[PDB]
């Protein structure tokens, strides 16, 4: 088990503060992203690639990753 | 143990769950629409029927296609 | 960690601030203040309210189960 | 030691108590009055006294009929 | 311990204290009047001389008759 | 607990949410949001920004070391 | 390891609540300091001396200390 998790391309997220990791497959989650981008709380760490996991933290930040949600929690190890 | 699979690969951190309840009551459908309004509704049912509603500490309301007991024992 | 408060509904113990009897407060005011801010959680499933669970983040959760028996389930 | 019975079956979680104080101070009587006004008051003193004022996080205020040192002793 | 006696039976949980400072300076007495107005002041001196100001996570300020480096000593 | 992010400045690892590369374009709004709002802490101390540390109090801290350097210095 | 850190002239700070400890060099912190001074979440534990470290806590308190930042951090233990 690691405190910080690689979410791709060197960007790190603390596991202690993750609320949820979800797929971008729905409409309510696209609104979560747009609401985040509007409030300046969106953190885009796909570095260009297709977004595959959406990380929501306590501080109401939304973090976009290029890896799969099962993979993210796995990288906790 | 820390991250819980609530259906279709969607993960939730057990450290932040306040409560898990049944969808089968009118007050709790109001909680769901109250969550869409403040932009705090996360739908993880992947299109299926809602069977557990997860309320986190950040006031997020998360919708799961899995029974509450199943979520509880997946800790 | 998780405590069954009746009818399958779970509350995480780590976030409960207080558990209070409906005879022992201006409960109707605490409850109606909770619905007003949209933080009322009804897990009585039609039965009578017998324990009121205040959590951090100001959620208020109605349970049909006796207060101290909820505590004993720790 | 986690949960405490402070009066008539009313429970408080020790991890969320900020301070247990004695009554008979002017500022705390405004804290009690402010919380009673603001809805965050929990009265466990069925009359007969008030000997401890319990302040938790999220400014919930709780009145108990036994001395603060006793309230702490129940840990 | 978990809870600290700060004078005359009044307790503070160590986990919620942010800072304990001397009363002897101008900036702190504005903190106190600020809290006294907004009703987040807790007076636990039982009338005696104010020698430490405790600032907790809920923005409460708690006045104690005991000295700051004594209050920290009662932790362990 | 306490990590040196360069030139004497410390950050407590328990309050970091994310550590991001200054490459990602949307963060530059994140930095200007903090700098304008007075929540920005610049510890690059003249040098070039190599990691952006975001904390729970919505503080944004600029550091001159790699995000991998910040996370690794935990140990 | 200890919970309370002596930051000068008897003033204590709980380590659990510290977010960051920084040098007074940066002109962005003077705005942070000066924001907190008028706003009334500033604590001045310098006892009149020159400011050597700025402690930023959870709940947005800004605590000014007269010792160096490495000094506050190493005095944890």
Output the CA angle F7-F13-F17, nearest 5 degrees: 110
Per the structure block, which two tokens stand in for B14?
């057990």
Per the structure block, which two tokens stand in for C12?
């995480």
Residue C34, SS3 per DSSP: helix
d(CA C64, CA C21): 11
How many angstroms separate the Cα of F22 from the Cα of each of A36, A45, E59?
19, 10, 34
Nearest alpha-carbon partner for A26 in C31, B36, G6: B36
Backbone angles phi, psi at F60, to 5 degrees: -125, 120
d(CA D31, CA D17): 15
Residues 6 or more apart in contact with residue E73 via CB below 8 angstroms: none
Nearest residue in chain A measured CA to CA from F72: A4
Nearest alpha-carbon partner for G29 in F48, F38, F64, F10: F38
Confirm or reject contact between E18 and chain D (CB < 8 A): no
Exposed/middle/buried for residue A22 (C-beta within 10 Å: 0-12, 13-18, 19+) = buried
Count CA atoms within 13 Å of residue G50 on its CB side.
5
Give the count of beta carbons closer than 10 Å to the beta carbon of residue A33: 16
Sheet of F10-12, strand order: F2-4, F10-12, G18-22, G53-57, G62-65, G42-44
d(CA C14, CA B38): 25
d(CA E68, CA E70): 5
d(CA E58, CA E44): 17
| DSSP one-letter code for A56 | E
Greatest distance between any 2 Cα atoms in chain E: 34
Confirm or reject contact between F26 and chain A (CB < 8 A): yes
Residues 6 or more apart in contact with residue G3 via CB below 8 angstroms: E14, E75, G14, G15, G16
Contact D58, D40 (CB under 8 A): yes
d(CA D10, CA D3): 10
Domain span including residue G69 = 4-74
Partners of A64 in beta bridges: A44, A54
Give the count of beta carbons closer than 10 Å to the beta carbon of residue A18: 26
How many angstroms separate the Cα of G49 from the Cα of each of E25, G20, G45, G52, G65?
12, 21, 9, 9, 9
Q: Which residues of G touch F1 (CB under 8 A)?
A: 15, 76
d(CA A69, CA A73): 7
**Resolution attained, angstroms:** 2.6
Exposed/middle/buried for residue A12 (C-beta within 10 Å: 0-12, 13-18, 19+) = buried
Confirm or reject contact between E10 and chain D (CB < 8 A): yes
- Partner-chain contact F12 G23, CB within 8 Å: no
Per the structure block, which two tokens stand in for B24?
């089968």
C-alpha dihedral, E72 to E74 to F1 to F7, nearest 10°: 20
Residues 6 or more apart in contact with residue B29 via CB below 8 angstroms: B23
Q: Which helix (H) or strand (E) holds D38?
A: helix D26-38
Beta strand extents in chain A (DSSP E only): 4-6, 12-14, 18-22, 42-44, 53-57, 62-65
Partners of A20 in beta bridges: A56, B12
Beta strand extents in E6-76 (DSSP E only): 11-13, 17-21, 41-43, 52-56, 61-64
Confirm or reject contact between D25 and chain C (CB < 8 A): no
d(CA B7, CA C13): 24
Residue D49, SS3 per DSSP: coil
Residues 6 or more apart in contact with residue E55 via CB below 8 angstroms: E17, E18, E19, E20, E21, E31, E61, E62, G43, G61
Contact of chains D and E by CB distance (3 or more pairs under 8 angstroms): yes
Residues 6 or more apart in contact with residue E71 via CB below 8 angstroms: E4, E6, E20, E52, E54, E64, G12
Asked how this structure was determined, the answer is X-ray
Per the structure block, which two tokens stand in for B2?
């820390």
Give the count of beta carbons closer than 10 Å to the beta carbon of residue F35: 16
Q: Give me the helices (H) in chain F, please.
A: 27-37, 67-72
Nearest alpha-carbon partner for F55 in B13, G43, G59, A36: G59
Nearest alpha-carbon partner for C43 in B68, B36, B58: B68
How many angstroms separate the Cα of C20 from the Cα of each of A65, C67, D20, E42?
43, 7, 18, 25
Contact G75, G14 (CB under 8 A): no
Residues 6 or more apart in contact with residue F54 via CB below 8 angstroms: A43, A59, A61, F16, F17, F18, F19, F20, F30, F60, F61
Residue found under tokens 């920290």: E72
Q: Pick from C6, C7, C8 the residue to mutate for testing the B interface (most B CBs within 10 Å).
A: C8
Contact B15, C56 (CB under 8 A): no
Nearest alpha-carbon partner for B52 in B32, B71, B30: B71
| DSSP one-letter code for E62 | E
Closest in B9, B13, B43 to A69, CB measured:
B9
Long-range contacts made by residues E56-59, C-beta under 8 angstroms, separation at least 24?
Answer: E56/D18, E56/D19, E56/E12, E56/E16, E56/E17, E56/E18, E57/D18, E57/D57, E57/E16, E57/E17, E57/E18, E57/G17, E57/G58, E57/G59, E58/D18, E58/D55, E58/D57, E58/D58, E58/D59, E58/E16, E59/E35, E59/G59
d(CA B9, CA B11): 6
Name chain C's partners: 3 or more CB pairs within 8 A: B, D
- Window F:32-71, CB contacts with A under 8 Å: 33, 54-56, 58, 66-68, 70-71
| DSSP one-letter code for A37 | H
How many angstroms separate the Cα of D18 from the Cα of each of A48, E4, F51?
47, 11, 36
Contact D62, D14 (CB under 8 A): no
Residue found under tokens 């509007």: A38
Domain count, chain C: 1
Per the structure block, which two tokens stand in for C47?
């039965």
Residue A72, SS3 per DSSP: helix
d(CA A32, CA B40): 7
How many angstroms separate the Cα of D64 from the Cα of each of D27, D51, E11, E12?
18, 6, 14, 16
């Amino acid at each position: 088990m690691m405190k910080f998790i690689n979410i791709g391309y060197g960007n790190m997220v603390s596991a202690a503060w993750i609320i949820t990791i979800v797929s971008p497959d729905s409409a309510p989650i696209k609104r979560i992203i747009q609401d985040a981008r509007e409030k300046g709380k969106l953190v885009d760490a796909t570095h260009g690639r297709r977004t595959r996991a959406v990380i929501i933290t306590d501080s109401d930040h939304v973090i976009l990753s290029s890896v799969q949600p099962e993979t993210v929690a796995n990288r906790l190890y």
